[PDB]
């Protein structure tokens, strides 16, 4: 990675299960980015979706940071394919699951673009999708998980207030300077028997609940 500052701490993200706060801390992570989403068809193994209130209390009590993210579908069922209508459906559900997990209204939700879209896909589908997220929870609460190209387009269009960079389609070694968070490792390690992805905190205010 080109140097562009350094990590301010590691956050883990995971869908397969719930990890006790003691095991997150023992893995050298300062918190987790957790799903405020349901399990899609073929995802009944995703016991990490959604975060429930008892887990949020365990993490918060242990002094760990919590960040909310949303991803329901993937690939041919990616959430953003449905544009404006899909954005209202997914944002409403994410906001309900965030509140039921104990998430505060002051905290954002990172909507996921788990893809490497063309600019035409971005204009036709991702722009109305993110506009609908902003219509439901507000611009100040809308986070975007996407590659660096998509973050740049969203920044230029004024969509989203928080950005979490993934590397699918991002130029090698590049970190977008607007990114709050950066996913740096995927499906290469487990914590408490649960497969995790590793993220670095880049900005001190990155959408943590507290």
UniProtKB/TrEMBL annotation:
<dbReference type="GO" id="GO:0046677">
    <property type="term" value="P:response to antibiotic"/>
</dbReference>
<dbReference type="InterPro" id="IPR006311">
    <property type="entry name" value="TAT_signal"/>
</dbReference>
<protein>
    <recommendedName>
        <fullName>Rv2525c-like glycoside hydrolase-like domain-containing protein</fullName>
    </recommendedName>
</protein>
<feature type="domain" description="Rv2525c-like glycoside hydrolase-like">
    <location>
        <begin position="23"/>
        <end position="200"/>
    </location>
</feature>
<dbReference type="InterPro" id="IPR017853">
    <property type="entry name" value="GH"/>
</dbReference>
<dbReference type="Pfam" id="PF08924">
    <property type="entry name" value="Rv2525c_GlyHyd-like"/>
</dbReference>
<dbReference type="InterPro" id="IPR019546">
    <property type="entry name" value="TAT_signal_bac_arc"/>
</dbReference>
<dbReference type="InterPro" id="IPR015020">
    <property type="entry name" value="Rv2525c-like_Glyco_Hydro-like"/>
</dbReference>
<dbReference type="GO" id="GO:0005576">
    <property type="term" value="C:extracellular region"/>
</dbReference>
């Amino acid at each position: 990675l080109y140097f562009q500052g350094g990590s301010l701490g590691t956050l883990l993200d995971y869908a397969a299960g719930v990890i006790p706060a003691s095991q997150i801390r023992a893995a050298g992570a300062v918190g987790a980015i957790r799903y405020v989403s349901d399990r899609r068809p073929g995802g009944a193994w995703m016991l990490g979706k959604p975060i429930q209130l008892s887990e949020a209390r365990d993490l918060s009590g242990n002094g760990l940071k919590i960040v909310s993210c949303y991803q329901y579908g993937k690939g041919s069922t990616a959430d953003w394919l449905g544009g404006a209508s899909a954005g209202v459906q997914h944002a409403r559900r994410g906001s309900e699951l965030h509140a039921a997990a104990g998430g505060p209204t002051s905290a954002p939700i990172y909507a996921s673009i788990d893809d490497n879209p063309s600019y035409e896909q971005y204009k036709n589908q991702i722009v109305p999708y993110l506009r609908s997220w902003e219509s439901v929870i507000g611009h100040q609460r809308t986070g975007v998980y996407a590659n660096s190209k998509t973050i740049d387009w969203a920044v230029n269009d004024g969509l989203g207030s928080y950005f979490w960079q993934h590397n699918w389609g991002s130029p090698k070694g590049y970190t977008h300077p607007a990114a709050h968070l950066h996913q740096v490792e995927i499906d290469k390690r487990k914590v408490g028997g649960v497969g995790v992805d590793v993220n670095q905190i880049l900005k001190p205010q990155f959408g943590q609940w507290a």
